[model samples]
Target chain A: SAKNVVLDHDGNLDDFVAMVLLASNTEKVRLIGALCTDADCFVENGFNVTGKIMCLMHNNMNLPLFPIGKSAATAVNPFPKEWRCLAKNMDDMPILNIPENVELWDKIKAENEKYEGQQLLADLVMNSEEKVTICVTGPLSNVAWCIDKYGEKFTSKVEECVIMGGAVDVRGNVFLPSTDGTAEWNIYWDPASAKTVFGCPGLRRIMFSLDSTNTVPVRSPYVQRFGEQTNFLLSILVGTMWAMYAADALTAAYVVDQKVANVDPVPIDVVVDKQPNEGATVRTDAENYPLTFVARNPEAEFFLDMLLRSARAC
Target chain B: SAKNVVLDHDGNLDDFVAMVLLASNTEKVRLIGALCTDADCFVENGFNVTGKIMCLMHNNMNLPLFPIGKSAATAVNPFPKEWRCLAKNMDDMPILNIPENVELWDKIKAENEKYEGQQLLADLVMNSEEKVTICVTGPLSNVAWCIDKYGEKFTSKVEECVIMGGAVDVRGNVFLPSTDGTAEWNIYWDPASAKTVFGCPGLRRIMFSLDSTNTVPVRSPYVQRFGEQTNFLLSILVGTMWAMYAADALTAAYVVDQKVANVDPVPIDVVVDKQPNEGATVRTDAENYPLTFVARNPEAEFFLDMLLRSARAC
Candidate 1:
């Protein structure tokens, strides 16, 4: 009811788990669809993970109103073969629930076959009666691919894109051997996609770079708050080391309510060249183009509280 | 008579002008070729600027024996149109000499037509009898492009590549509107290319990130030292605001004499994906791959003295 929303993510335990919880509990916004982009893991693994989480979150109930999307089988620059194999191993693990693992895998496989990720995104964006807010927590390949296939017609459908990528004013995580050390993981994975998305004619964009994300340290107190909630959501949230600072969850919350974080409307560009700085999100003050707002610094305590409350609601 | 060297750069008035001076003066290394990468400006503009500098540096003398290389005419992600235009205007200005403006433009135009930048780089690497020492002071686009086209065969020709880019353990320039605050302009401008070069098999890559460059502040004493040497090099060095920390000059000096700075053999990788940490030069202690050496904190006084000595020799 608050606003229609779509989430595009690269499969990671934290992000997949967070999306399931958000779609199940958040009443502030309507979940329209979920699309996976390439990032921390392979797209298929991410797609499968999202499907598994969806099954768990909506156990024995009608699944959410929207369709789940798939990532491209290959990217312009795919994740390393070694990395993909490791991620695939993680995907096969019965980390969530051993008893239900067999059933969950079947459901996930079925869910993935329903629709291709980018095509669904295009359909949803084109047909939606209300403006759709998009939450992105991975490399922007899916969105950029949509832009490339459909051009400006596809971009005009969305209200705004709230992204969890880049390191506009802070240190980034993915270091050398992987990147040049100035870029964040989400944007660095596929900078050409990010550049295409950022350069799209009328799309409204908001970014939460490392500047905002790094400030909120995930600690024991925050995790302890979720102990009272005893469901698949809590189990997934508490089990992983990444639950401390769930960046994707934070982006989802901001989409639900803008007041959850602070943002500054700045003209931004994504570095798409084959250089050391590729995939960097550059903010240009002089440009009068469609401005991309970036999070100034969100209230860390408030963000944690929101996450705790969402987990409890499920 | 010295070890043959090739320099790859993006057009910055400071870096381009400094390389010309280094090539003319340094006795430890011979100038083999100059290659332009996309960075401070577009490749064509950078190509033109380097040609202009070569013409100036070799005025009344035989030009150095080397062909210049060109980067891809367009990057996967090009610079913003507004930024490109302004950079073009600055490039158009005859900031060096007012009297020879018209003649310099004509010479620059003619010099640019001589060869394609990347092809010359491949030829120089493949044909050179001695292992070439490559000095890169801009984005690593040209070198990366060669790797993409020629694979391992292109990289095998180089003895080592010394680069001036990335932030490593320190803050970088090209902050805010141009990049996240942590990225240096050279690497940030083309991170994908940097990642490719860093990951090349059997290639020995050495980098001087901002951690080493930022410590040496260019103040009065350093400026005063250059005052005694009144040549074209000194005029250009003293003219621009960029002389404060001549990173390119430092790279050139290191090529001439490795002992000018301290270096550590660290495993490094550049982030090539689409993530917040793109273009980040991450140092991994775990990987057993070929190590990419990085400059440790350099002796500021020693570097400035070396620069002064190099300029005085001309």
Candidate 2:
């Protein structure tokens, strides 16, 4: 039997790629639910993008998985407006906006009207029959909410937390003057949630931080090699992944198959304070510090092979 | 032999669709050269988009035609910063940013380093072996430049100007505090050039203005029906044409086959002065008013058929 899974993402082009990766690999990772968070994207458009990806993967709008839900969580330090605008444009992409699929957005939206991101993730994690891996390509808001509501039950049910965030061994990507330049965007968006989620005692966590993802940069040659394959949806969908770091997609890879990446256990804690270094994922020596298996390097070639294989599947 | 043509467009998502339409139907309408104007887009990205479209249609980056040039003509009232940002996002789309083709952009750009939009369109029109039909999808800056430099020589060799601009019968789309809301973006950007181009005697111009394009609104049903066809490039390339008014795409249809739309020759002239209605296309009874065959309504179904037929071809 495949490992049960749930995905949580804040909408961005990278998150959209992760969504496709998850939708393509449903057989290997039985996705029970998907929750869209409001960071790094116009959250509503992100919700619509989920429906479209489902529509693209399955000819029918038949989503046996629970209806997609949006996060009600607010941000501490939101992503730049310009960066968020890219999500609106991504939703507008011709590949995602297949005419018939536009209707799927309306249908899925109605079905999901009763739910929001926090409860959807909490319920899915608590209710899964088997251990569920939570693949998160954005902030940890939903995960924190899950832990808050269900406590030990959520952590006990969760097999592993696969996340794309932080910059443990290196300087961060956030450039705002208010920041100390030591935090990745996903963690920086909501440091409190990151701290809360990482503190869960029973959680099995793996992090594909900027430290690991930097070693796996996406250049044009990599994308060209990837697109050259006969994977229809994957090849057609591959674009600016060449330009951005493949943090989200790499995390999806680890979820489907663990051996493709090398993650060393690191005792870490997130800075949730008034200091400029807030949100930074720092190595800590405190007792009971969260032990996260941080990815140091990923097998680059195998990553593409897995994506291509997953996308090639029906 | 196919009719010779040159394309001039301000970069927008719609213009990229038009670029693909032209590239896909190279045999039907021979694109001698393409010039990128600084109206709706960052003109540099538009030049880059031209190269990628060429690379996509033909596997190799072989351009026997003239280099893609950027318009040096300055704008009076430019497109909104937000509207122009969409072009930047359009250039970033995965479909257009295919990895290997990205390298093609650098190569083609270097080859066109010495050229600019005005002289390229001017030289192409002046020296065409046969009558050249100039497709102006943005401002009439380059077209006006051609008329200014070569005068009657430019006017005489022009087969017809199939332009997407102006609002004849209806209120215009421009909304700014400085002027009356009676001007379309393409004309408002450079009214002096619009006046110069429209005033060119002996120039046979047919315009798919806001008046005609408004009648052919792109709803979900039309886009859904359009995407249902099996033409790979066309089907895969279709997107938010559903959300936008299909002014540029409809104009592309006119360039390939004039019969897909109907036009009535209206004696028209553009307002070049600051009467607060700076770029309105007004019906005039003045002596020697430019005669433009303004499309009253396009064959809605046939427009898609033409795009489909044109896109289906090599």
Candidate 3:
């Protein structure tokens, strides 16, 4: 049987949707809830997009959704504004079908009670009988907030936290004029929060940094076959428009089958306060400092097949 | 003209002795004083050996020699004992002549007044009219102690501090059985002191890690030419017995001529508190944190040539 899991995301259309669908399809994983945060897009837009996607996936079934909350707007570096613009056009996507009787916001509010995302995280982790695996695909604000609010109680219940952020030995994607060139977007978005989460006691943190993610080339032809087996909506998304880096989905798949990736447990520190280095994850083998296991070289084809199968199931 | 410099060392026979000899011989450099600390050998042995060598160099002349002091000795690793045993045997070396009237230790103490190394460092830095360059080839205890004793005054007066320690992106030499294996011995000896030195507010630090040093092969045929020009004593020492990686001498040489090595200015943090990683220098491009310029990929042939020239000058 699969572990009880919570999928936390900042709505980046491709992998967020893919991960949710994959987790839902997998019998081993008991998909608990999807909590949205601000990252690739603003919280409002992210929540809306996530709600619409979930609605499309489980249109006829009853599933719990978590309410989104505003995270700190002052990023360590400037946030990626263009991604939000792309997210704005997500409303026009053909796959989503909004109910005629209720407005999208109203329907989402009615379906999921008005609780802060961090509160929902704390409640879920604290109340669960089994240790819950938290899969984070965005900035670590919500998770950090949970730790700040509930302390070790929140961390004690977590089986592990798997994140898709930072670049260990590899070059990062996002570049800021004010800082150094090597900075990944998710951690860069909220380095203070990432630092707090890293400091949390008794937490087993696993990261799939750019070292692993960057290895899977974007817009590869091999990824196009994923569209053919799934629906026209998925085909359109994965075939052309999407970023094609399935970091979030791969994170979820690792939870389903740990064999999908090779992980190395080493001490990791996120550069929170320093300029140019803020959001950089400093990893070393010198100290027995509480560490985060990072995914090194993963089986890209295996991950793609798992993602395609999940999409087909959805 | 060469910079008025302070040579700090841990008494490794090959490089430390070579650096002192080079600094003293070079017309450009005004060799201020040699500050010895515990490293390749114990502080007592280190001071005795360094003083004896300096006495031999400036014995007939009126060149002032600074007395060495005991540095904190709770090393993160075991000190290299074999080098000390070799240092003890250095008394028999033909180059060093002991006057029949005075013993080596007695001659050293008589020539150089016994002042605490740290106090002497503070006095030298504070009193000097020109900014003095500090070249450190050992654990940073003496320097850190000076900072603790006299805060900004000590850091502000020094033009720059060049250290031959740590492994930035390279594997370290000393392998520990208890913890992860990746720590260079110099910084590892007194990581807390190294940390303090790295954190000095207004200081300009530069490091030559194993990343650069390991590339220069020890006991190479090119080094054999030094013995031919210098002496059979220099031959046996630099040719076979010595750890031919002359990092200390290279540091001094860099002071003499900046063209000796390639330098990159980057933010560097020494792992001071943690085990295994203690003394590890962490370099990053993320922030404009007070940086330490690290020596990378030196021109080995040029460095060897310069070293040979310096030894021949002596």
State the C-alpha RMSD over the true interface residues for candidate 3, after superposing those residues: 36.6
Residue lDDT tens for model 3, B1-314: 65577777766655455555444554667777766665576566566656666665555333455545544544555575553434443433323423421254475574454566677777778888899888788778778888898889888899888888888887887676643657788878777788888777699887888887777765434543443542322332333234216666667667777787879876777776667666677864655677778888888778777665555443
Candidate 2 residue B151 Cα shift, in angstroms, is 1.9
Q: Best by DockQ, which number?
A: 2
- DockQ class, candidate 1: incorrect
- All candidates' TM-scores? 0.46, 0.76, 0.46
Model 2, residue A165: C-alpha shift (Å):
3.3
Q: Which pairs of residues clash in candidate 3, taking residues 3 or more apart in a chain or in different chains?
A: A2-A28, A275-B287, A276-B286, A276-B287, A277-B286, A277-B287, A286-B276, A286-B277
Residues B1-314 of candidate 1 have per-residue lDDT tens digits of 68878888776655664575457654576787887766567767676656555554555344563566666534544444445322232233232222343265565565546778778788888899989988887778778877899988888888999988887777656444534665555665677877778777689888888777766665643453332443333333332222226676677767877786878877767665655555677776655866777887776667676665655443
Model 2 — TM-score against the truth?
0.76
Mind giving the per-residue lDDT tens digits that candidate 1 earns over A110-169?
Answer: 655678888888888888998888888877888888888887777888888888888777
- Candidate 3, residue A247: the lDDT equals 70
Separate DockQ for every predicted complex = 0.01, 0.20, 0.00
lDDT of 2 at A152: 92
The number of the candidate with the highest TM-score is 2
- Interface RMSD, all candidates in order, equals 30.1, 5.3, 36.6
Query: Per-residue lDDT tens digits of candidate 2, residues A1-314?
Result: 67788889987777877777776666576777788887888888788777777776666323354568888988988888877765565555455555566666666668785787888888887777777889999999888888888789788988899999999889999877777799888998899989987777789899999988888776544554444442355455555333227789899888888876888888878999967888998988888777889997789889877766665553
Candidate 3 Cα errors over 4 Å, as ranges:
A60-74, A98-113, A218-220, A230-244, A284-287, B1-314
